Design a protein around this ligand. Structure first.
Ligand SMILES: O=C1Cc2cc(Nc3ncnc(Cl)c3Cl)ccc2N1
Ligand SMILES: O=C1Cc2cc(Nc3ncnc(Cl)c3Cl)ccc2N1
Ligand SMILES: [Cl-]
Ligand SMILES: [Cl-]
Lengths: 4, 124, 124, 4
């Protein structure tokens, strides 16, 4: 999971 | 927004759509390319091809279970492009590049047409 | 094999599937969550959820045009997860995390359940 | 395009  | 994003989600979705295609699950169309038949999901074809997008948004053609391609279309070129639609991987070879590029032009798959043009230019 | 791969292909496919969902094109099921209704593509739901994969591979349920979820399922939690299925982006907030995690457990979306567990653990 |  990432900060887009 | 403040959303978080799962990096592998799109790839995992496409992998599962290809698994459903391989097991012939919820496929809703057969693409006829001369003597050859290819089962697929209309939504995936539309998501990958400007030609299929135009066909399946048509109020009469959206309901057809069989689509016949132009007789000049090569079945192997189509097979290679259908595999690309469902996997992101393109089996481009010296022996098939002309058929793949012609099929990609007909199907309106601009990124495939672009790489074929570049691969051909390098060999000239 | 000796294939070449188009990096953005899976993301571009998912983007187009979401555009078809927004315009209600070739959607083939309505998911009923108490008073709320959500139109979707069965193939995308199966590709994202262990619950929908089980439902739509069932020889009788594969043909239903309406699926009713358990009354304990929260419509907003479902909406957030449906948006995630079609975009890879999850709108996870303090005010919705419990409903999102419970809905993801019911839908069998293990990566969502995992991030909810981690976000909850950090706040404890 | 890349070599996967
Ligand atoms: O080279 C390409 C690949 C392609 C796909 C589609 N597909 C869609 N485009 C916009 N909205 C929607 Cl809803 C879809 Cl399905 C249309 C044109 C092209 N051209
Ligand atoms: O957490 C998750 C996400 C998910 C999706 C699916 N989907 C599929 N799996 C295998 N082959 C096929 Cl054909 C599909 Cl469609 C099944 C289980 C789970 N669990
Ligand atoms: Cl393309
Ligand atoms: Cl997930």
């Amino acid at each position: 999971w990432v900060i887009p | 927004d403040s959303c978080i994003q799962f990096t592998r989600h799109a790839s995992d979705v496409l992998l599962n759509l290809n698994r459903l295609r391989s097991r012939d699950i919820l496929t809703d169309v057969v693409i006829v390319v001369s003597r050859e038949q290819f089962r697929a999901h209309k939504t995936v074809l539309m998501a990958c091809s400007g030609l299929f997008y135009s066909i399946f948004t048509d109020q009469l053609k959206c309901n057809l279970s069989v689509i016949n391609l132009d007789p000049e279309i090569n079945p192997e070129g189509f097979c290679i492009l259908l595999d690309f639609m469902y996997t992101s991987r393109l089996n481009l070879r010296e022996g098939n590049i002309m058929a793949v590029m012609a099929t990609a032009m007909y199907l309106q798959m601009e990124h495939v047409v672009d790489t074929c043009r570049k691969f051909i230019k390098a060999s000239e």
